[PDB]
RNA sequence: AGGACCGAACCGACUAAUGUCGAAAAAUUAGCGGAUGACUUGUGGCUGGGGGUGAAAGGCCAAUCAAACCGGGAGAUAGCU
RNA sequence: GUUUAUUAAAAACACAGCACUGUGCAAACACGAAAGUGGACGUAUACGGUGUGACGCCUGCCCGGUGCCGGGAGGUUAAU
RNA sequence: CUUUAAUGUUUGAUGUUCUAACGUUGACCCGUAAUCCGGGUUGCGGACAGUGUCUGGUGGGUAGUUUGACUGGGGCGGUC
């Protein structure tokens, strides 16, 4: 649900909430966390590799199961959960012979709901099928690029991909970036797409919202000095630059895409 | 005003101690032309 | 390169000439596979006495064997029993090691590696055609007819 | 480091003249690539960085008089 | 409930005066701003100089920063005093 | 809210929001002669860069030039 | 010689298939109470990708330097 609050003060009056009710009121799955110290964007060499990264509040990682390798093993939805590492929500699953894992949430997903995985499965949503089980035209999540993997693609919230052609041996996938990808037919996928799906809604309200939710606050180039930017300098807010990123190579229209590997997987780009 | 000397006998031994010099070469180094010029105190430490 | 050859090449099979090869080519098949041997003014002489003619026959019982055991089966037709979905979408795709793994229990004794699929990797439920490749120039014909239970 | 394991080649450090003579210091680097190679005397691959040339002495000299020199070398492959 | 209000501790440093061989190599006195948060603080770690870090001032990096400090090339060079 | 510790606390910076653009994941990108890390135990409702800066009404005309993206007849064009 | 057509030859651009080089930040087993690494088995890619030498283009991202004298101060103008 969306809810958005009254304006009772600057910094609440944009806030627009996205309350679940359904969510679990209660602390997590102990036996499935495991810490996750944050980085702040530097690396092995205790550089800023990635900026506009750090602070944030302290949030446990949860082992989300993507392989979904318990084949024939009718599983029962415990509850849904928040978890702060997804944009979208994540099911405590209770496997029949009585253990309990985290899976991805589809749309129409809920408490009580039956899931199974492998090729002697339904078409109901949440179910975990191969491609070349799954009927062309469907629309499928968390799917795989290489069997075994675990899944890659379609895992934010309300994301999904369908099937468009299916040429023997090979899948063709759209990608909600309108990207045509080739993938290995045995490889994994599951039936429905994430939910979640008004994570747009919301809009965090004010400027400290998204500082404990991990961003650093950014800093224009026009701003900066002429040493430590390519733009910068001037007085009275000059440009007079094409533009480019802060180490010289220039954004705004010039593809980076050079892999020469995958692109035999590549049908159609972006558009 | 805080000076910029903050005394701390933990961050000073594992900053310039015997043992903080010996670990990589340089400091190794610093050792050795300290002996050499003959220095009473080769480090610090109590 | 010069190398003499040992098994019988489709296209510069001679047994033993001296014809340029590429260098790439022996190091990569030719050696690891004992096809040939490297022989610069050195092996040549072994080659003309200890393995011009002897070396001929331990070649052809080889080749003997091979046919002789790959016309075990009389019956040259293989059934297996799949819990094929419903109207077709069988339950999951199968390569070479079931197969040959019932072969080996029941038919001919043969190894992994010998099982070629030309037509697919037998998807479809039904009969199809399976070529196995024994020898460089012997192909063997088998019927698989897979039942849906 | 890359150092090929047959000829002993290193990298060497060297200038580039330019057209106007003008100088900077560069580095050839030897082609070593990292091939695996079938020795009959323990019937396995042997895994080894060598360069061009020295995949050539392989293919001429004796795959196991290279390995035999390579052990008096010291060096373990 | 609140980057909500008034206001001490705490953090900050807008105005004035004093002090400029001062008590102090930026302080005191009287007012002033924030004060449940993008807050503040202790301890210990990480980022090393054509680099770091920077809610961005060429600011900060041991009272020094449009390129720190120490030693060396080095008795650099000085058509200048 | 932040900033020129030690003459400038502001109209400057940041800001939620908006837009453009790159990136199909061995992602782009960054630190590294490399390995390997960060991005992220994330994967397009995500991430990087750039500009603008709540919200309201809007955001017009021009593709010559300089960039960027796509095409390809012909010309020119290194090593070899 | 102008103008044609078989077989064999030097072949090279182009396309298809295969795997044994090579790739695998796919899976499983072992060393090994080990997310590294190595080996084995297998799958997927595959003579591409990637790397070395040579070479064209791009390249203030970075570096080393230059940017005259006369002159009723200098600059501008003019002059040499």
């Given at each position: ?271 | ?46 | ?115 070629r699929l030309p037509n697919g990797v037998l998807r479809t439920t039904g009969e199809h055609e399976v070529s196995f490749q024994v020898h460089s120039e012997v192909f063997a014909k088998v019927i698989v007819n897979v039942v849906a239970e | 480091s890359r150092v090929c394991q047959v000829t002993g080649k290193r990298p060497v450090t060297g200038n580039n003249r330019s057209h106007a003579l003008n100088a900077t210091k560069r580095r050839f680097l030897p082609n070593l690539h990292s091939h695996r190679f079938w020795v009959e005397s323990e019937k396995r691959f ?32």
């Open positions: 649900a969306v809810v958005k609050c009254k304006p009772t003060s600057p910094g609440r009056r944009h806030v627009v909430k996205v309350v679940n009710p359904e969510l679990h009121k209660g602390k997590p799955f102990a036996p499935l966390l495991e810490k996750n110290s944050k980085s702040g964007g530097r690396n092995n060499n205790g550089r800023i590799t990635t900026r506009h990264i750090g602070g944030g509040h302290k949030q446990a990682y949860r082992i989300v199961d993507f392989k979904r390798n318990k084949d024939g093993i009718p599983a029962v939805v415990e509850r849904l959960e928040y978890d702060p590492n997804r944009s979208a929500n994540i099911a405590l699953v209770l496997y029949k012979d009585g253990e309990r894992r985290y899976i991805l949430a589809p749309k129409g997903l809920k408490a009580g709901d039956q899931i199974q995985s492998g090729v002697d499965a339904a078409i109901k949503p949440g179910n975990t099928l191969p491609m070349r089980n799954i009927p062309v035209g469907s629309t499928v999540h968390n799917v795989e690029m290489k069997p075994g993997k675990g899944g890659q693609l379609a895992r934010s919230a309300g994301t999904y991909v369908q099937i468009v052609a299916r040429d023997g041996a090979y899948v063709t996938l759209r990608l909600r970036s309108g990207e045509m990808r080739k993938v290995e037919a045995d490889c994994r996928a599951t039936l429905g797409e994430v939910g979640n799906a008004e994570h747009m809604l919301r809009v965090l309200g004010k400027a400290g919202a998204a500082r404990w939710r991990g961003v650093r606050p950014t800093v224009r180039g026009t701003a900066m000095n002429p040493v430590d930017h390519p733009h910068g300098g001037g007085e009275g807010r000059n440009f007079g630059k094409h533009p480019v990123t802060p180490w010289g190579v220039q954004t705004k229209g010039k593809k980076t895409r050079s892999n020469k590997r995958t692109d035999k997987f590549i049908v159609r780009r972006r558009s | 005003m805080k000076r910029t000397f903050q005394p701390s006998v933990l961050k000073r031994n594992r900053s310039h101690g015997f043992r903080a010099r010996m670990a990589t070469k340089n400091g190794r180094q610093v050792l050795a032309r300290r002996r050499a010029k003959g220095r009473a105190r080769l480090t610090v430490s109590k | 390169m010069q190398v003499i050859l040992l098994d019988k090449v489709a296209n510069l099979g001679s047994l033993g000439d001296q014809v340029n090869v590429k260098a790439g080519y022996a190091r990569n098949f030719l050696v690891p596979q004992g096809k040939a041997v490297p022989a610069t003014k050195k092996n040549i002489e072994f080659f003309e006495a200890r393995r011009a003619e002897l070396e001929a026959k331990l070649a052809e019982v080889l080749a003997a064997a091979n046919a002789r055991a790959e016309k075990i089966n009389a019956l040259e037709t293989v059934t297996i029993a799949s819990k094929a979905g419903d109207e077709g979408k069988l339950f999951g795709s199968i390569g070479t090691r079931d197969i040959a793994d019932a072969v080996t229990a029941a038919g001919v004794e043969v190894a992994k590696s010998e099982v | 042997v895994t080894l960085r060598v360069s061009a040339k020295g995949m050539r002495v392989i293919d001429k000299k004796g795959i196991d008089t290279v390995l035999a020199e390579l052990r008096a070398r010291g060096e373990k492959y």
